[PDB]
């Protein structure tokens, strides 16, 4: 007879307030694709328009979800991720999709295929406001491999809601997105009702069509390094030892390598009292720029903090350190660690070591298109596609904006 704690729709906004850098939210979605339970080898991040709404999409070729798993994804605190074959999940908290999605936009939808079933999940602030829901309710529709519904009572109600309040008015509209996952397995996340300032999106898509950017009005709370304002630059350094390929705006992201990025590389070790094991550090002088230097702190192969100054905050420059600390704990937005005693010690050690180091030491990739078999029109393709079907038609186009034979061909780049 004991009551369950309840979730109010308003909390959805509240849970997003930790992200003050939007890329933190983006990073979270990427992480979920990266994690070994999904095991995606590609993630495509795109900007498109659907039903007159600017949309951000995250599409991956990973394992997908059962319906129940979908529910957990749309629920708070459920995570069951284990290391596989030395692939360690970043995911811990069980909050990352909600916090990220909602930070990016009011409304989000998840289409997933696990190769036995496909499901569609709705997490909308807008929907909840309209129906004046007192609880967070997440519609789910599920289908067999044959496009036949299952779990009908849930599905019927869910579909009715989704069709009515969703971007996608028709069943036909929904399955198109399911179709945009080319493989048997995978997931597509669509987010709309993006944060707008000055009646325009927080993001700037105009300046570089191959990037998602933060407008000039840019630096973090903290001359800004690129990763601060370019998603592409950020994605490059996001993973220390990349296991997945990220495509932004259809152009794949070229990962940096320490070699060819740094000179006078030297190794160092951290042997805290509190730790069983040693932790390596790599110190380098920064080739590309100068102004960008500091420590790169990675946790579980993912980047938490970058360009953090240590030791000498002038004096000591162009110096970079790379360390991975799996013993620290990330904060709510995974952009910092908990400010513990151990964290403090690590920072201290890093500075001393860096100081020692200092004293001691002194063409984008080609686009690809396919021709439609029933227009003869050429339609643009994103990188990272291993296989095309024998014949390709505008109808099966993943890009929402050229799914019609009657859609004029895009000019190639001037």
């Amino acid at each position: 007879g004991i009551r369950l704690s309840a979730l109010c729709p308003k909390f959805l906004h509240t849970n997003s307030t930790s992200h003050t850098w939007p890329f933190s939210a983006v990073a979270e979605l990427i992480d979920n694709a990266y994690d070994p339970d999904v095991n995606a080898k590609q993630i495509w991040i795109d900007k498109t328009v659907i039903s007159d709404h600017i949309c951000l999409t995250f599409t991956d070729n990973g394992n997908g979800m059962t319906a129940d798993k979908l529910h957990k994804m749309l629920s708070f605190g459920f995570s069951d991720k284990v290391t596989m074959n030395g692939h360690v999940p970043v995911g811990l908290y069980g909050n990352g999709f909600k916090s990220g999605s909602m930070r990016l936009g009011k409304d989000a939808m998840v289409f997933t295929k696990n190769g036995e079933t496909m499901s569609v999940g709705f997490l909308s602030q807008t929907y909840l406001e309209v129906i004046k829901a007192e609880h967070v309710v997440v519609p789910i529709v599920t289908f067999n491999k044959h496009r036949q519904m299952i779990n009908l009572t849930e599905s019927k109600a869910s579909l009715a809601a989704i069709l009515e309040h969703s971007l996608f008015s028709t069943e036909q509209k929904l399955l198109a997105e399911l179709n945009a996952i080319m493989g048997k397995k995978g997931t597509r996340i669509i987010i709309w009702n993006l944060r707008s300032y000055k009646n325009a999106t927080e993001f700037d898509f105009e300046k570089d069509k191959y990037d998602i950017r933060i407008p000039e009005d840019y630096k973090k709370q903290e001359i800004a390094p690129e990763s601060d304002y370019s998603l592409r630059a950020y994605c490059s350094i996001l993973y220390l030892k990349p296991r997945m390929q990220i495509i932004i705006r259809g152009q794949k992201v070229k990962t940096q390598l320490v070699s060819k990025s740094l000179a006078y590389i030297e190794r160092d070790v951290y042997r805290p009292k509190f730790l069983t094991r040693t932790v390596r550090i790599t110190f380098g002088f920064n080739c590309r720029n100068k102004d960008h230097y500091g420590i790169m702190m990675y946790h579980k192969n993912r980047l938490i903090k970058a360009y953090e100054k240590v030791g000498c905050q002038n004096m000591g420059v162009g110096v970079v350190g790379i360390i991975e600390c799996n013993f620290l704990k990330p904060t709510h937005n995974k952009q910092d660690f908990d400010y513990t005693n151990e964290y403090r010690l690590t920072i201290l050690a890093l500075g001393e070591k860096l100081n020692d180091y200092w004293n001691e030491m002194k063409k984008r990739p080609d686009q690809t298109w396919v021709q439609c078999d029933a227009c003869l029109k050429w339609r643009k393709l994103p990188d990272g596609i291993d296989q095309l079907p024998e014949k390709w038609y505008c109808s099966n186009n993943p890009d929402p904006q050229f799914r019609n034979c009657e859609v004029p061909e895009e000019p190639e780049d001037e």
Binding site: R364, P365, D366, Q367, W369, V370, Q371, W378, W392, D413
Partner: peptide, 9 residues
Amino acid sequence: ARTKQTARK
């Protein structure tokens, strides 16, 4: 199917 290639930018 048929696939062109192109320069970017």
